[PDB]
């Protein structure tokens, strides 16, 4: 009954400019002002992490050899048309900031955003808070 999705919260260390991380957000092709990390539904015989890795590869062209999976995950439960949804994000750090992002038909744009940009990108509280808490983890 719950729609379950899995994604990689992909981050990178922000380049110097005269909350030090950025997160890869993708703009949905089929929605209005809808930006999320790479994510999607299970396929067969997948752990949540396997699903997250595959969906990230499908949606960005970035495979798991390009990032370091970190010891942080969070499950967000929220409503979509009053239908319960749960999305689990696994934090990973992209080792080369400048990896070429290759979008699929699912998205029209991407942006590496800081946690402070959450309101600008109209993120729901669950996602905004995910970014802040991930940055807290990254600063341990």
The C-alpha atoms of residue 47 and residue 104 are separated, in whole angstroms, by 23
Which method was used?
X-ray
Q: Of how many residues is the chain composed? A: 140
Cα 118 from Cα 139, distance rounded (Å):
19
Structural domains counted in the chain: 1
The per-residue DSSP string of 69-137 comes to EEEEEEEEEEEETTEEEEEEEEEEEESSTT------TTEEEEEEE-GGGTTTTT--HHHHHHHHHHHHH
Q: What is the DSSP letter of 61?
A: S
Number of C-beta neighbours around residue 16 at 10 A: 6
Q: What is the DSSP string of 22-56?
A: EEEEEEESSSSS-EE-SEEE--TT--HHHHHHHHH
Query: Could you tell me whether strands 39-41 and 35-36 are parallel, antiparallel, or unpaired per DSSP bridges?
Result: unpaired
Whether 34 and 107 have beta carbons less than 8 Å apart is answered as: no
* Distance of alpha carbon 30 from alpha carbon 86, whole angstroms: 20
CB count in 10 Å sphere of residue 31 = 10
Name the phi and psi angles at 63, rounded to 5.
-90, 165
Give the Cα separation of 18 and 133 in Å (integer): 24
How many angstroms separate the first and last alpha carbons of the chain? Answer: 37
CATH of the domain at 17: 3.90.79.10
**Residues of the domain holding 23:** 1-140
Q: Are 16 and 4 in contact (CB under 8 A)?
A: no
């Amino acid at each position: 009954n719950i729609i379950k999705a899995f994604g990689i919260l992909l981050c990178r260390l922000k380049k110097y400019n005269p909350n030090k991380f950025e997160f890869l957000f993708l703009k949905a092709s089929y929605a209005d002002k809808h930006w999320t990390p790479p994510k999607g539904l299970h396929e067969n015989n997948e752990s949540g992490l396997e699903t997250a890795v595959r969906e990230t590869l499908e949606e960005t062209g970035i495979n798991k050899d390009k990032y370091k999976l970190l010891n942080y995950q969070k499950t967000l439960k929220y409503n979509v048309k009053d239908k319960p949804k749960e999305t689990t994000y696994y934090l990973a750090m992209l080792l080369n900031n400048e990896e070429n992002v290759i979008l699929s038909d699912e998205h029209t744009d991407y942006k590496w955003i800081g946690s402070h940009e959450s309101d600008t990108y109209n993120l729901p509280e669950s996602l905004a808070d995910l970014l802040k808490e991930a940055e807290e983890f990254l600063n341990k």
